[PDB]
Amino acid sequence: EVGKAEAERPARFLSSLWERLPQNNFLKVIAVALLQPPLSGEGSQVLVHWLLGNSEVFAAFCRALPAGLLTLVTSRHPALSPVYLGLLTDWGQRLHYDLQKGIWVGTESQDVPWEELHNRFQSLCQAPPPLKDKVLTALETCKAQDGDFEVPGLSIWTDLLLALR
């Protein structure tokens, strides 16, 4: 209805909603609306633009939801893929390996753990082929960027690629 009105742009309505109502609920709802087939997909087409415009919401979008939902979203909308891997690629890099417990960990408490990040990459790899090659190349290019090791304790990306197999 706002689109047909054309008075104010949809993004302004959505930004106001974002301040107004509960965020956790809202994000699940956006995720779900991105996948409902059209009935008149201009709706979903608007939300992708809004999300790519607003980085802060997308930081909590990918962070709060479960894995398969984000996977299906990203496979439906290829415009969300290159940013999502970029979000994940930045969360790994701020981990550190401790030798006594064989687990990558973060410094700050709000840094994504190993298990959640593994779950996300596993879901992305268990997906259609158009995204599998994307994530795989993004991981290999980030491995070689940090020394092309083939042994654990040195690169989170080597450790991911080892755990996928």
Partner: protein, 150 residues
């Protein structure tokens, strides 16, 4: 010690009561314990390495391993006793010596042959994927360490 090895290189029961029959077989604290050529060639090599004569120690240790592992046909030459080092520790000492000499490309062939020969004993390193509980003796780790410094 150099002389003692060459000395040990060279190899009657009377119907009567002699002294030898009554004297006890000697212990390890005694000065009359003298092990075999191999168990003394290891003393020479160990004492040559503890002082900083590592080139000489390398030749001594390779001579030792030649004795121990080329022993199929002739009379046997045993390894040191199990107060002293176990048979992997001997290889490690050899490789340390070869590093200090400047023979790292031989200190890798030592370590490769050691892991080749004990492959069946090494753990399968599938716990590497699953990450205190499993078992690995020190010498496997130490092998990779020397293999690195090389």
């Amino acid at each position: 010690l150099e002389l003692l090895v060459e000395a040990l290189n060279v190899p009657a029961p009377q119907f009567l009561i002699e002294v030898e029959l009554l004297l006890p077989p000697p212990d390890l604290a005694s000065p009359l314990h003298c092990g075999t050529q191999s168990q003394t060639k290891h003393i020479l090599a160990s004492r040559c390495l503890q002082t900083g004569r590592a080139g000489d120690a390398a030749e001594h240790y390779l001579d030792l391993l030649a004795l121990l592992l080329d022993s199929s046909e002739p009379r046997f030459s045993p390894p040191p006793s199990p107060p002293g080092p176990c048979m992997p520790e001997v290889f490690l000492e050899a490789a340390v010596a070869l590093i200090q000499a400047g023979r790292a490309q031989d200190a890798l062939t030592l370590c490769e042959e050691l892991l080749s020969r004990t492959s069946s004993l090494l753990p399968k390193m599938s716990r590497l994927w699953e990450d205190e509980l499993p078992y690995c003796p020190l010498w496997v780790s130490a092998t990779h360490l020397l293999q690195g410094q090389a």
